[PDB]
Design a protein around this nucleic acid. Structure first.
Lengths: 136, 234, 191, 144, 217, 36
RNA sequence: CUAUCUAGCGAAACCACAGCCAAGGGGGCUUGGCAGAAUCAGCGGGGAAACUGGCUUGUGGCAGUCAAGCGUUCAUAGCGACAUUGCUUUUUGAUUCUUCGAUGUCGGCUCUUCCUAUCAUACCGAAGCAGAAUUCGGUAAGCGUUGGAUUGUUCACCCACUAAUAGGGAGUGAGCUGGGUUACCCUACUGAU
RNA sequence: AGAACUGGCGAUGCGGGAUGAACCGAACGUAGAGUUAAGGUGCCGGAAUACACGCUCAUCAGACACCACAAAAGGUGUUAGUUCAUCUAGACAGCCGGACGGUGGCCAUGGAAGUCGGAAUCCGCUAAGGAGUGUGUAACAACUCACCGGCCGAAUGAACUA
């Protein structure tokens, strides 16, 4: 979470383990992300560290630019593609699963965003909400 | 009480204990003094200063001023009529009650009895006494003299001594920056009251020899007359 | 060395009266009364007459007789605590944050209430024991006075009170602030 | 022994102040007991005692301040005596190497005053001994 | 920070209200508490506490001794100047799948090997000399001037309890050894240079890998 | 509290007869030394 | 589908006796804890290779310096504690593919439970501990202690996360890895009359 | 470890040792009565909660066979001793006073004044007061012992053993 990361986190569904490739929505030139780790987890015997929306994750890049590929960096989840629950009653999900990059203090690296983003993520984090064109 | 005793503090100091050798030494030495000198004076001196005694001794070298422990001085003088170096000494061994102290002269009586009335110094309260002044300490910065001299030239008191002022001296002493301050004025004492030990100590801490010092005497003996004399002069 | 008989003297003054059944004491004087059980201590008491009472032990071990001297001094402390009464004086010093100190009564509880400690919001209450009274200092800044007959109650209450402000995890040489005792006197002044 | 010596230097280095020498700084050097403590107090929240004795300040004291929407540091020296420039105590030596190293203005706290009652010949010969190290220093005297 | 800052705060404020009383009282309480620890500390801590307490005691005994002591009242040349002073004792170890091809013996003890070893092949060898347990150096002390110098072995002439351990080179107690003297550099009659002397070892190599030897003088 | 394990005070015979045999070894060593 | 129950048919293996547990005795005896008729279904833990002698633990050897004391005497006839000087494979935060020829076995994953000598978590003490953070030390084992990549000699590992990613016993001599030399009887347990 | 002698066990039961290859006692036909060994006598368990001198009170004592291994010692727990020291010509505890002058002794330093620190160990008056234990301020100052002396009057203290 760290400096900048605002608020608390509600319990949302933990769809994405480590090692699920997802797309990237910013205008850095990075195409896709590959998670290697999640931050702020617990631990349970032979659990995988599970990722969700609204989470700041340690993750590498596979396709993209040569400068940013294949090195671990902080990333926010924005799109799940597995069904989660709102507290105002509805269940929902996106077409495909997606996350963006940013620094450890939560500040955005790119200058744009594609596609819709998570409401809880944009509420929890300022800067994706600053760079967000689309939410829900 | 073989165990669970106190441990008395051991050190490596230089001075060692005297014992009976010095006791009997001074005993025989005053007994040597007795036949040698002629005029004998018993000196009650309760408050005493080392430089005052040395001042008196270097004033009068033809005299000899001796001090030592009381009961051995009574011994060497002789306490009974039955045991005494010379006669008519037991009766004046009775009276010598206070801190004594003794002199062996051959000079006149008149010169000394006027000397010790002329001889006056300045000393401290030494309580169970009066001190001929009162002291209010003002509700400001506190100083080494305690309001005696002007406030420009007195030096404020050191920040080391203040917890002693809070503990021993019973006084509220509150610490602003590096000098020391008080919030209410503090009167320490009045005239015409017997000074207490904390009162004596605070005037000591201010460093005030406000009390007069003069020695009294009670009596006199002469060897050649072999007669006792009683004189209360202060 | 198994001392056979040990003994001490305690001095009753003219004003005060004392009633001792078996190992119970009551001590009554002008300021009031006190009581104390001493059944755990296994000694003997005796009057001779009315200004002096004798405590004693027969067949004493070291522990037994050290207890004898102790019990004398305890009873003397009670005697002083009636005829004089005891009086303990504290001050509550701060660098940045003034204490708000108060007295309250919750169903007759006589709690002592401190706030603004080190910029806290916390209320801390301390009880008052029976038999002891408070006064905040009139015409003296940042000072409180306690007075009572039970010396043990007084000291326990104030020792509690400075034990409350045991400021924690912080360098004592810097945080000189706290509430502490100025001195332990009697009430009287004169005597 | 050397580890305990290093324990003491650990302690002292932790007590050392924080300086970036690269940045906009104002060295303040003067004679002892001239009113530098009053000066730094009046510009800056730093309560150094003003008391009239020889070695009052023993090490390098900082006060940060601001003017015209800028940030400045002000670095006052413990004060200097002659010790004439051949061999010297480390206090004046670190003051000298501070003059030597830090690239910012230097300020002389002159006492054209009745106080600081060392004589003006002492003051000016001290100044004359520190003339050669005023090469590139942007020296600025002020009378107090 | 930045300064003699706590000392400054002490100078300006007095280091607490109640510090002196507590320090006094603590050193009062230490008498009882040290003995409480002397009776408590079930295990290893009574040991260290006692050892430590014995040490401070004996040092205070030295203090009184040196106080009383205060109270009561080498022909070397120049170039050496400026120096600071079978059926038993054998386990048949059957090797291979079919345990009848034993053929094997192992040395489990230290040895000096010499400069050139020219180690024989595997099939003809019977005894196995491992690699680690090979001392080139040993500490030789001098009886005179008690100087400890860390010098090489050249050879082992004598080994007790066998003529075999002589040639093998085992370095146990009782083994006399051919020791270099190169840095000491004594001038003998004729002005020769010494390269070999005799030393007697005084410690087991197994219990410690150091090898102390007294130089035979 | 959690009141922890004790050692016994039980006899545990092997240690008794080990003590006796050890004792005789000690006294034997004493006699071997005692001529000096 | 069996397992289960019922109508009918109907064996065998195996069997000294039979059975409740801990410590002790260099399954039964001794001392103790409990045990209430008779019994059903699951169960897989059992069923005529690990202290010589209180083993083991944190503090080198050898030669010296004091010697507390010991030697019934001797101090160097002689012992001798605690300390302390003596280098110990490269003295200036210069620095070796020392994991290189060991034919030797040891290395690894789920789950119980225990100990504490605590890695965090709780409370405390001292530390130049301004604070935040952090080092030592005390009580304390109630709870907790992660996911991956890896072998002609991984050797001890890196990667990250986590408040932390502490240590050992009794363990699979029943499943798995190497260059590799009648679990059907009763027992107790869990459920049930 | 090796020898030499001797005794036990082996072929052998019984009492006690809580139980038992090695311990302690003990000459095995069946029965009665009596007395005892070694071991024990709070209850199990037959026998005195016997008598008597002492010491011990463990925050997991000990009930041990013993010299024996951790072991030499620590310990303000406790009892008894030994050897020394002090004293109503005033012991120890304490409370009170003095605790000085040359002197701020020499370098040493920015500052060093009995105490940042190196080395010196004086005399003077002295009842006694160090070229000076310990807190100490930047130095100085102030306070305390070690040393004497005033009040009290009574035995006390160092070391060592067990």
């Amino acid at each position: 979470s760290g400096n900048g990361a605002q608020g608390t986190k509600f319990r949302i569904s933990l769809g994405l383990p480590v090692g699920a490739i997802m797309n990237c929505a910013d205008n850095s030139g990075a195409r896709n992300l590959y998670i290697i780790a999640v931050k702020g987890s617990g631990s349970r015997l032979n659990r995988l560290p599970a990722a969700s929306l609204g989470d700041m994750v340690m993750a590498t890049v596979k396709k993209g630019k040569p400068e940013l590929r294949k090195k671990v960096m902080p990333a926010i989840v924005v799109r799940q593609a597995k069904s989660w629950r709102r507290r105002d009653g509805v269940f929902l999900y996106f077409e495909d699963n997606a996350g963006v990059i940013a620094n450890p203090k939560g500040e955005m690296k790119g200058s744009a965003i594609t596609g819709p983003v998570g409401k809880e993520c944009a509420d929890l984090w300022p800067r994706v909400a600053s760079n967000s064109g689309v939410v829900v | 009480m073989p165990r669970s005793k106190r441990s008395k503090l051991v050190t490596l100091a230089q001075t060692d204990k005297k014992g009976r050798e010095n006791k009997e030494r001074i005993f025989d030495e005053v007994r040597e003094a007795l036949d040698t000198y002629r005029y004998v004076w018993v000196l009650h001196l309760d408050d005493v200063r080392t430089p005052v005694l040395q001042e008196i001794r270097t004033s009068w070298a033809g005299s000899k001023l001796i001090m030592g422990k009381r009961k051995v001085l009574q011994k060497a003088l002789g306490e009974k009529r039955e045991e005494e170096y010379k006669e008519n000494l037991y009766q004046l061994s009775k009276l010598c009650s206070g801190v004594t102290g003794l002199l062996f002269t051959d000079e006149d009586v008149n010169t000394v009895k006027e000397y010790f009335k002329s001889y006056v110094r300045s000393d401290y309260s030494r309580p169970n006494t009066k001190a001929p002044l009162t002291f209010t300490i003002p509700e400001g910065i506190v100083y080494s003299r305690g309001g005696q001299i002007p406030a420009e030239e007195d030096v404020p008191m050191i920040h080391s001594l203040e917890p002693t002022m809070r503990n021993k001296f019973e006084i509220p002493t509150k610490i602003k920056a590096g000098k020391i301050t008080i919030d209410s004025p503090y009167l320490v004492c009045t005239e015409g009251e017997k000074l207490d030990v904390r009162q004596a100590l605070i005037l000591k801490q201010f460093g005030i020899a406000a009390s007069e010092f003069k020695v009294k005497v009670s009596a006199y003996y002469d060897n050649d007359s072999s007669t006792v004399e009683s004189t209360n002069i202060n | 060395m198994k001392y056979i008989q040990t003994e001490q003297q305690i001095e009753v003054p003219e004003g005060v009266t004392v009633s001792i059944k078996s190992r119970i004491v009551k001590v009554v004087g002008p300021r009031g009364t006190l009581t104390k059980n001493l059944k755990h201590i296994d000694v003997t008491f005796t009057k001779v007459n009315n200004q002096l009472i004798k405590v004693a032990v027969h067949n004493g071990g070291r522990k037994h007789v050290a207890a004898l001297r102790t019990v004398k001094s305890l009873v003397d402390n009670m005697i002083t605590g009636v005829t004089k009464g005891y009086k303990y004086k504290m001050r509550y010093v701060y660098a940045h944050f003034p204490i708000n100190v108060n007295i309250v009564e919750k169903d007759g509880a006589k709690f002592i209430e401190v706030r603004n400690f080190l910029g806290d919001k916390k209320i801390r209450n301390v009880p008052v024991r029976d038999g002891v009274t408070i006064e905040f200092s009139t015409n003296v800044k940042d000072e409180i006075v306690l007075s009572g007959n039970s010396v043990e109650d007084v000291s326990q209450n104030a020792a509690d009170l400075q034990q409350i402000c045991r400021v924690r995890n912080k360098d004592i040489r810097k945080f000189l602030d706290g509430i502490y005792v100025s001195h332990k006197g009697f009430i009287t002044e004169d005597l | 022994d050397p580890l305990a010596y290093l324990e003491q230097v650990r302690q002292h280095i932790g007590r050392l102040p924080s300086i970036d020498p690269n940045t906009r700084t104002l060295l303040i050097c003067g004679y002892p007991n001239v009113g530098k403590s009053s000066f730094l107090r009046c510009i800056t929240k730093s309560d150094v005692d003003v008391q009239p004795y020889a070695f009052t300040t023993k090490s390098l004291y900082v006060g940060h301040f601001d003017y015209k929407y800028l940030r400045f540091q002000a670095i006052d020296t413990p004060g200097i005596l002659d010790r004439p420039t051949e061999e010297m105590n480390n206090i004046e030596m670190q003051s000298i190497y501070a003059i030597a190293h830090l690239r910012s203005c230097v300020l002389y706290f002159m006492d054209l005053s009745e106080q600081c009652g060392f004589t003006i010949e002492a003051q000016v010969k001290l100044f004359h001994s520190i003339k050669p190290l005023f090469a590139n220093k942007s020296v600025m005297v002020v009378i107090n | 920070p930045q300064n003699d800052y706590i000392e400054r705060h002490i100078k300006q404020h007095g280091k607490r209200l109640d510090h002196e009383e507590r320090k006094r009282k603590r050193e009062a309480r230490e008498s009882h508490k040290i003995s409480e620890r002397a009776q408590k500390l079930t295990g290893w801590k009574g040991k260290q506490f006692a050892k430590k307490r014995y040490a401070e005691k004996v040092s205070m005994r030295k203090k009184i001794k040196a106080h009383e002591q205060s109270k009561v009242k080498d022909a070397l040349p120049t170039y050496l100047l400026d120096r600071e002073q079978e059926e038993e004792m054998f386990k048949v170890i059957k090797t291979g799948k079919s345990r009848s091809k034993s053929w094997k013996r192992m040395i489990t003890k230290h040895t000096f090997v010499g400069e050139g070893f020219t180690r024989r092949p595997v099939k003809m060898e019977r005894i196995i000399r491992p690699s680690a347990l090979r001392q080139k150096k040993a500490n030789v002390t001098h009886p005179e001037l008690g100087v400890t110098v860390f010098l090489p072995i050249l050879a082992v002439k004598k080994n007790p309890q066998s003529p075999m351990y002589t040639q093998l080179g085992v370095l146990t107690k009782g083994t006399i050894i051919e020791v270099n003297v190169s840095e000491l550099g004594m001038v003998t009659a004729g002005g020769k240079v010494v390269w070999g002397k005799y030393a007697q070892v005084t410690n087991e190599p197994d219990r410690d890998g150091c090898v102390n030897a007294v130089l035979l003088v | 509290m959690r009141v922890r394990k004790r050692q016994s005070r039980r006899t545990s015979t092997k240690l008794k007869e080990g003590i006796k045999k050890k004792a005789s070894a000690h006294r034997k060593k004493e006699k071997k030394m005692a001529k000096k």
